[PDB]
Amino acid sequence: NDVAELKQYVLAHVSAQNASADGVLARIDDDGDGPRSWTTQWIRAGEEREQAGDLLAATTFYNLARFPFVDSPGRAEALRRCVAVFDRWRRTVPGIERLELRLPGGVVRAWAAGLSTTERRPVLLMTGGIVSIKEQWAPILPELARYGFAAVVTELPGVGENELRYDLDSAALFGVLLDAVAERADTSRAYALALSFSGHLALRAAPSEPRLRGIVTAGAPVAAFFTDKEWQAAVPRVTVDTLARLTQTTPATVFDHVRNWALTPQDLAGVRIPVAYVASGRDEIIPPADPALLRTHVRDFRTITHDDVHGSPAHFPHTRLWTLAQVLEMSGADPRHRAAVDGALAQVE
Amino acid sequence: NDVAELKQYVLAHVSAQNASADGVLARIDDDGDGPRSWTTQWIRAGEEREQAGDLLAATTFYNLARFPFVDSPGRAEALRRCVAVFDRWRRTVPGIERLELRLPGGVVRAWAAGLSTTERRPVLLMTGGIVSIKEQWAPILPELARYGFAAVVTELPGVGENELRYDLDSAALFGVLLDAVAERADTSRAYALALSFSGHLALRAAPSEPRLRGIVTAGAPVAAFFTDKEWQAAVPRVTVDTLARLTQTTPATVFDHVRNWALTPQDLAGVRIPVAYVASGRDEIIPPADPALLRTHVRDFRTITHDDVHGSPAHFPHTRLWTLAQVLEMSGADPRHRAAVDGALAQVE
């Protein structure tokens, strides 16, 4: 992995939320093994905070150690202790449960909250993209539960502890998670807060999974991402390598491998549910043609655009409230919750 | 206090950094001392996170309980617990120490890092505004120390554990802080990173404190803030009440009391150092004419405007880098540090 690419992810998506990260960046010279390497430095910084009692700080740093995907025994150890340190933290928070699903293609693990035997709460499935482990979003589970959801936070196939191969049959993962919490939630009403590539997977699942009632995404790939080769040549190496790893192909073959993932107009027409999309004006990963294709073909499309890079990290104050407003509208959540968020949303604009 | 005002500060300056905050806001109906009151809910939320081992989260919540100023035994108790839980956190972080100055007019406390009897590192004095206690910024001391500074974080007179009366002689505070760390730092070269009202104090002190070599501020009141009665009538009640409390006057008299705080053209002509200024276009506290007067009267003025409310909380990613860049250029810090910040600062733009 190119270390400049790796550092630039921290600068844009982390430094502003934890400024100790800039101190660790300044001790990292390469991506190998060894005392000044990315993985070692991030692991040592996580041990320091873990031993100091800061279990979320330690979670962040061990997450960073494993980023962008586990390609080494140093990284595999990173993830193992990111998962474990977050497991320690979550126990001091009531209502956060581990879900384990054993499937033919391997094990999927997840974090949930707002689950109940006696009540039937609408399901919120939350997933990042291809470099985003589930422990990034899990801390937010209690807030999700407060808004009325049986909230499940997971990982795309090949990410974190998710063992499946990432392929077109992974669209079926929404439905299988639903099946696992059917005794503890209203799986008749599910909503996918599915960021980046997981948004693509959600779109693909919609036409043959009627329990999915709405999708809220940010910078999901659609069609041009998979078909436009010139654009692909300029896509960051980390995107290409990670997607190779997840699909179980190779950096040089992955775009040809995934060419038939393109959502056709027949596929978008089967999407008969509300779709919200947060778009980034400077997106390095998604071509402009993809958000446009959803605007043309999806019957109930809501969208907003920020002048930012992928995942709009400089616009989190706006995107957290906008994505949440969309989720509550789609699910017909309590007006009191909707007024609160919409008041907070009007405040930021 | 007006509980709606209180909740909006949390909405604009905190929620995006800690989403648990929105959960506690939903349980607060008033600013009394009942079980659904502001102070009780924030204290209960800090206890829960303190018992769980999240000492920074607890610090934040006890800070909120105390906010905007201690006017009751509940808030006083909040503050005492905020200071104590911050003290436990910082014992886990090597280099962070407590400074206590016993003055004629009362006791001032501070957090410092990067102090050394065998080196002479330039001083970075850091201070918030009138509702901003020490412990909000203290977590970033080690980052300040990493950039080469002998860093001291403190509070305005009457805020947090600072016992002084906030008056015109309070400009002498910077110089007295320097004196206390004269054996452990290069107090010939001091830089004030002084937000909001502390910015004004710093400007005031500059022409009679030659050890102050530069000021980096955000939304500092200058002149019009103090003299324009029409503007003052629409200033938020919490600003009015806090300022009355600090100055040891009353809400109905505070603007008449501080009318002579306005920095005259003679005052500004005595400011012979660089001053950087982050301005907010929707600033609800500082009239436009204040930034403009500094542009015309300060010989080395640097500035930048965001489309945001006071303290530009939606633009933290940008302001952390811009203010830091300014501090490092001002202080002739190592070019390796300036290159890294200026790279980060070009990425975020």
Side-chain angles (χ1 to χ4, degrees), chain B residues 216-219 275-281 291 301-308 312 315 318-323 326 345 348-349:
Chain B
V216 176
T217 187
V275 175
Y277 191 115
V278 181
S280 306
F301 190 63
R302 304 99 183 268
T303 202
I304 196 153
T305 294
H306 304 298
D307 176 28
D308 204 346
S312 290
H315 295 75
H318 194 303
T319 64
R320 64 188 276 285
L321 299 171
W322 189 87
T323 56
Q326 288 289 340
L345 177 60
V348 85
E349 281 163 5

Side-chain angles (χ1 to χ4, degrees), chain B residues 92-160:
Chain B
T92 209
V93 175
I96 304 183
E97 60 191 291
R98 198 190 274 282
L99 298 185
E100 185 180 41
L101 294 64
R102 304 190 140 281
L103 294 168
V107 183
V108 179
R109 288 147 101 84
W111 292 113
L115 305 190
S116 175
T117 61
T118 61
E119 307 193 309
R120 287 291 174 275
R121 292 152 56 83
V123 179
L124 187 57
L125 304 180
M126 174 158 197
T127 38
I130 62 180
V131 298
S132 186
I133 64 186
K134 253 164 28 257
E135 289 73 26
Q136 181 184 347
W137 315 106
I140 55 66
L141 283 170
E143 276 286 295
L144 290 173
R146 200 181 52 86
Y147 285 115
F149 294 105
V152 181
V153 176
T154 193
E155 268 152 349
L156 287 187
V159 175

